[PDB]
Amino acid sequence: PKKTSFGSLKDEDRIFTNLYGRHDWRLKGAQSRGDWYKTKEILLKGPDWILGEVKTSGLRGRGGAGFPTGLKWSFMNKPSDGRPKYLVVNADEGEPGTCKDREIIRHDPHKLVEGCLVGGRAMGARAAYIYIRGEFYNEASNLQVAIREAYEAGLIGKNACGSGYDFDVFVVRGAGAYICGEETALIESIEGKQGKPRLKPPFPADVGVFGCPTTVANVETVAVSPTICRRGGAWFASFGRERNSGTKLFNISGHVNNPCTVEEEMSVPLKELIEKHAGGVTGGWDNLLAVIPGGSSTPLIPKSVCETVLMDFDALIQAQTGLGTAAVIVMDRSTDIVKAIARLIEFYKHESCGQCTPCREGVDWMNKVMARFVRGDARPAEIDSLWEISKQIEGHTICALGDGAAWPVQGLIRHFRPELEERMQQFAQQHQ
Amino acid sequence: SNLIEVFVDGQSVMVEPGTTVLQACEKVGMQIPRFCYHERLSVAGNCRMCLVEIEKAPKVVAACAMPVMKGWNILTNSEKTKKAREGVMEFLLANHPLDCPICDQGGECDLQDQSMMFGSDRSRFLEGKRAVEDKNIGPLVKTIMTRCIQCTRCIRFASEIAGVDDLGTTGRGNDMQVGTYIEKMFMSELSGNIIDICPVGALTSKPYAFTARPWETRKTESIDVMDAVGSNIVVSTRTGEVMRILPRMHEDINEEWISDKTR
Amino acid sequence: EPFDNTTYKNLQHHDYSTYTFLDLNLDLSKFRMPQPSSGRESPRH
Amino acid sequence: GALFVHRDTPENNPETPFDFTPENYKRIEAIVKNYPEGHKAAAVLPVLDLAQRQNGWLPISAMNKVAEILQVPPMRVYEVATFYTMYNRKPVGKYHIQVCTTTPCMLRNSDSILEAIQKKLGIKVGETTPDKLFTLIEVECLGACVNAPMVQINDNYYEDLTPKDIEEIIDELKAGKIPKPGPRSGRFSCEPAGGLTSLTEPPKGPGFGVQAGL
Ligand SMILES: Cc1cc2nc3c(=O)[nH]c(=O)nc-3n(C[C@H](O)[C@H](O)[C@H](O)COP(=O)(O)O)c2cc1C
Ligand code: SF4
Ligand code: SF4
Ligand code: SF4
Ligand code: FES
Ligand code: FES
Ligand SMILES: [K+]
């Protein structure tokens, strides 16, 4: 029956077979690895069949929120009200510690392009706008070159793959804002405005880019759809736990011997993932201080939790953190944990779009308090003050960037309050 | 027929579909706090002062932007709602300058009043405050942008009512600044109205500067004769002297706007 | 056929120039489908 | 410096000469056609970038010219130019060094990289060399954390740097040369240094694992 331990994924089950760019990344290389194979038959089965496969696979968003992808793509499976329907692929990839989306674009720019056609067909869209980080200039070019080849081969454009379905794939480059990864702020950027997220309940599936139905999906979420439709949703569901099905890309960075990007089965133990693929922690699994398991947005967890925690949404939620983008950041015992988290709050203070009050003023307020905790120029009573300020940002903002700046502070105060208080005693006795 | 029943504090009210939570609360005499929502401007949803709790939901919703759904119970005075208004007001006043004695808005300032009614009573902000450089936009509107709370009312008014796309937001995060970027004069026949919609003393009247306080003026409700529209005005007098001219709402003539000549 | 798994095969980006991305966008205009219209030249019309 | 209000100067004013080259006007009309008719304002970001690529920075005249061709209010372009960090509203050198300093790079001694560049070029963060060759700034995560520490120069990434690898790169740039982008260590893009731990077997062919129908 079901499994208990997860990991040790065979290469024949991996989806991104050119993750390290050691084969041809152009059309001929992609086709030899299975890309664009029998894509016409996928299209002719209609949106219902494609949406069914994603539902069965239990796939969940890979951008950081983890909503059920198959259920999220069914909002666009409605009749036409006279407006065009678009698909926006989120390639902003701005979360600190996250590098997975860079490799998919630069080394497999035909699973992404094929994903747009299959994902677009499910939603009934006419075209796909791929929003790629503005600093990824070289990656955007390879994406354009692959898109050009797809057009020349008849794989996209008019009568895509001989299916009678017209689909155009456009690439639009950002201009250097982390907030443009947010789905609505991404849409506002495509429309020529500032990267300021919109409010809901006007949802992108009802009023989106150019005021039209749209779906915003991560590159990894879109770059695995064609494989699921071919190998089946049953095959994809065979990995990871229940409700955490699938293979996941991981970025293991920080204080590890061999920082790298690898693909691994969901629910893989955190200790195994670092040891097996990343060469372990610098100084062995005893110099470990804390880990940020899902990019800067997620709270850190200390060594005690890291012993047995599994890398999936449900397991990390129970550990008072999240999976996020599966961007594992490892910090050893030589790290200034207060200073490491202070730089993350400075990052969010430089990336706040500045629209809504709690994160315009609150994040800039958390940054200044953190800048004093690092030096210890604060009282212990300000730790609880910092906690309360954090809870006033979380849930009161337009977008989740405010939430993503509260959680790192809360993680620091949850597990490392003794460190913060000791830092303040040292300053107090020195600066009498 | 098409009305949907919603509850405000448990009291039932029948509203049209598309009515916002803020508008539903108006039908029972409850005014939700606000700094960015104006009934004659487009919805912005960026001051968060209108956050209100919906029973059986964990996240507070923006009252000015959220449409009501059938059966909702809006808790306009719950603990969760009251703690939201205190958190937002705390953020609004963190970098706000201590200009109240020298600020023309004092005594008729929404930030002051809503801070008394919905905010806390003391500060726990121990850092240094932000300070922005002023921006000359003409001889009528005085600009002191350290008092701005980034509500964008002036931006939306200038674009939707006046038809002049000269005010915007330059910057990002805590350094975001409202203004014209270039040295430009916001000269229009409706320009004086940004003084009234600006909830704070960031935009004030230059002819009226320092002359009076709101509480000592007598409000005489009169008519305007500068043109043939007949805008309804309020004439503020102080000890037998006219101090300023304010708009008076008339839905069929001028709403709450007056021309610069009338002002 | 040669399974040369020990070489990087993504060196084409060492030759990209300051106008590479936009030139590719220009080359693709001949393949795009006709764009839809809102019936007006701008929201200000 | 780092100001978001424009003050006219002889070197930057609405009379400063700027106009797209005839080649760029063909690029602009290609960009403008990527968006639905009646939404030409969607092309501000790519057309502002194209203006910067031609010029190297964005004088106030450049911003106005983009507003004219797109029929958008100039203030709306000023909002976009001031919002995004990549747009340069002040002249920079031909080589714009951007050192990441966020935590994943800070953990792997990205401060040492910054010190090396500062000592070599004899400047501080945010300054420009007297010859208008190099400008040094700190940026946020550039999306190459596994290859930390790293810098960006113009459109290229240089990765897995050490205080010696970065100094060599500036030497090649400084004289006449164009260093090749990519990690400066023994690995290629992101693989585990010391040998692949996955994707060692040959990839499967066109139709492996296909289900019945497909
Ligand atoms: C501040 C912020 C930054 C974000 N950046 C990204 C990103 O770079 N790539 C991405 O796929 N999703 C990002 N997201 C999440 C998106 O808003 C959205 O949840 C996701 O892209 C939806 O696509 P998915 O189903 O593949 O997850 C970000 C969210 C926030 C609040
Ligand atoms: S939380 Fe911050 S980034 Fe998000 S909309 Fe509000 S101000 Fe902008
Ligand atoms: S705007 Fe209101 S709160 Fe601010 S200084 Fe003026 S009177 Fe005081
Ligand atoms: S100047 Fe006044 S009206 Fe304009 S954004 Fe600031 S507070 Fe709002
Ligand atoms: S009045 Fe609703 S957010 Fe400002
Ligand atoms: S933290 Fe430097 S590239 Fe991500
Ligand atoms: K005012």
From Swiss-Prot, chain A:
Modified residues (Omega-N-methylarginine): 231
Residues annotated for FMN binding in this entry: 173-221
Keyword Electron transport: yes
MF-aspect GO terms: 4 iron, 4 sulfur cluster binding; FMN binding; metal ion binding; NAD binding; NADH dehydrogenase (ubiquinone) activity
Modified residues (N6-succinyllysine): 55
Enzyme Commission number(s) of this protein: 7.1.1.2
SUPFAM superfamilies membership: Nqo1 FMN-binding domain-like (SSF142019), Nqo1 middle domain-like (SSF142984), Nqo1C-terminal domain-like (SSF140490)
InterPro entries to which the protein is assigned, alphabetical: ComplexI_51kDa_subunit, NADH-UbQ_OxRdtase_51kDa_CS, NADH-UbQ_OxRdtase_suF, Nuo51_FMN-bd, Nuo51_FMN-bd_sf, Nuop51_4Fe4S-bd, Nuop51_4Fe4S-bd_sf, SLBB_dom
One Gene Ontology biological process: mitochondrial electron transport, NADH to ubiquinone
Record: residues binding [4Fe-4S] cluster: 353, 356, 359, 399
Keyword match Acetylation: yes
Catalytic activity: a ubiquinone + NADH + 5 H(+)(in) = a ubiquinol + NAD(+) + 4 H(+)(out)
Residue numbers of N6-acetyllysine PTMs: 55, 78, 349
Gene3D superfamilies to which the protein is assigned, alphabetical: 3.10.20.600, NADH-ubiquinone oxidoreductase 51kDa subunit (3.40.50.11540), NADH-ubiquinone oxidoreductase 51kDa subunit, iron-sulphur binding domain (1.20.1440.230)
GO cellular component: mitochondrial inner membrane; respiratory chain complex I
Location, primary (coarse class): mitochondrion
Binding site for NADH: 61-70
Subcellular location: Mitochondrion inner membrane
Bilayer topology annotation: Peripheral membrane protein
Bound cofactor: record note: Binds 1 FMN.
Entry keywords, A to Z: 4Fe-4S, Acetylation, Electron transport, Flavoprotein, FMN, Iron, Iron-sulfur, Membrane, Metal-binding, Methylation, Mitochondrion, Mitochondrion inner membrane, NAD, Oxidoreductase, Respiratory chain, Transit peptide, Translocase, Transport, Ubiquinone
Family (UniProt): Belongs to the complex I 51 kDa subunit family.
Protein's name in the database: NADH dehydrogenase [ubiquinone] flavoprotein 1, mitochondrial
Organism: Bos taurus
Gene name tied to this protein: NDUFV1
Swiss-Prot record, chain B:
Limits of the 2Fe-2S ferredoxin-type domain: 2-80
Similarity annotation: Belongs to the complex I 75 kDa subunit family.
First and last residues shown, out of full length: 29 to 291 of 727
Location of the protein in the cell: Mitochondrion inner membrane
Name of the protein in question: NADH-ubiquinone oxidoreductase 75 kDa subunit, mitochondrial
Annotated positions of the N6-acetyllysine modification: 56
Sites where the protein binds [2Fe-2S] cluster: 36, 47, 50, 64
Name of the gene this protein is made from: NDUFS1
Ranges for domain 4Fe-4S Mo/W bis-MGD-type: 217-263
Keywords for this protein: 2Fe-2S, 4Fe-4S, Acetylation, Electron transport, Iron, Iron-sulfur, Membrane, Metal-binding, Mitochondrion, Mitochondrion inner membrane, NAD, Oxidoreductase, Respiratory chain, Transit peptide, Translocase, Transport, Ubiquinone
Biological process, per Gene Ontology: mitochondrial electron transport, NADH to ubiquinone; mitochondrial respiratory chain complex I assembly
Residues binding [4Fe-4S] cluster 2, per UniProt: 148, 151, 154, 198
Main subcellular location: mitochondrion
Superkingdom assignment: Eukaryota
Binding site for [4Fe-4S] cluster 1: 96, 100, 103, 109
Residue ranges of domain 4Fe-4S His(Cys)3-ligated-type in the record: 80-119
Function: Core subunit of the mitochondrial membrane respiratory chain NADH dehydrogenase (Complex I) which catalyzes electron transfer from NADH through the respiratory chain, using ubiquinone as an electron acceptor. Essential for catalysing the entry and efficient transfer of electrons within complex I. Plays a key role in the assembly and stability of complex I and participates in the association of complex I with ubiquinol-cytochrome reductase complex (Complex III) to form supercomplexes.
From Swiss-Prot, chain C:
Compartmental location: Mitochondrion inner membrane
Record PTM Phosphoserine, positions in chain: 42
Function text: Accessory subunit of the mitochondrial membrane respiratory chain NADH dehydrogenase (Complex I), that is believed not to be involved in catalysis. Complex I functions in the transfer of electrons from NADH to the respiratory chain. The immediate electron acceptor for the enzyme is believed to be ubiquinone. May be the terminally assembled subunit of Complex I.
Subunit structure: Complex I is composed of 45 different subunits. This is a component of the flavoprotein-sulfur (FP) fragment of the enzyme.
Similarity comment: Belongs to the complex I NDUFV3 subunit family.
The protein, known as: NADH dehydrogenase [ubiquinone] flavoprotein 3, mitochondrial
Organism: Bos taurus (Bovine)
Swiss-Prot record, chain D:
Gene Ontology CC, one term: mitochondrion
Keywords: 2Fe-2S, Acetylation, Electron transport, Iron, Iron-sulfur, Membrane, Metal-binding, Mitochondrion, Mitochondrion inner membrane, NAD, Oxidoreductase, Phosphoprotein, Respiratory chain, Transit peptide, Translocase, Transport, Ubiquinone
Region of interest (Disordered), ranges: 178-214
Enzyme's top EC category: translocase
Cofactor mode of binding and number, as noted: Binds 1 [2Fe-2S] cluster.
Cofactor(s), by name: [2Fe-2S] cluster
Entry EC no(s): 7.1.1.2
Binding site for [2Fe-2S] cluster: 100, 105, 141, 145
Membrane topology: Peripheral membrane protein
Localization: Mitochondrion inner membrane
Gene3D superfamilies: Glutaredoxin, NADH-quinone oxidoreductase subunit E
Record PTM N6-acetyllysine, positions in chain: 26
In-chain residues carrying the UniProt-annotated modification Phosphotyrosine: 158
Role description: Core subunit of the mitochondrial membrane respiratory chain NADH dehydrogenase (Complex I) which catalyzes electron transfer from NADH through the respiratory chain, using ubiquinone as an electron acceptor. Parts of the peripheral arm of the enzyme, where the electrons from NADH are accepted by flavin mononucleotide (FMN) and then passed along a chain of iron-sulfur clusters by electron tunnelling to the final acceptor ubiquinone. Contains one iron-sulfur cluster.
Subunit comment: Core subunit of respiratory chain NADH dehydrogenase (Complex I) which is composed of 45 different subunits. This is a component of the flavoprotein-sulfur (FP) fragment of the enzyme.
Family: Belongs to the complex I 24 kDa subunit family.
Protein name per the record: NADH dehydrogenase [ubiquinone] flavoprotein 2, mitochondrial
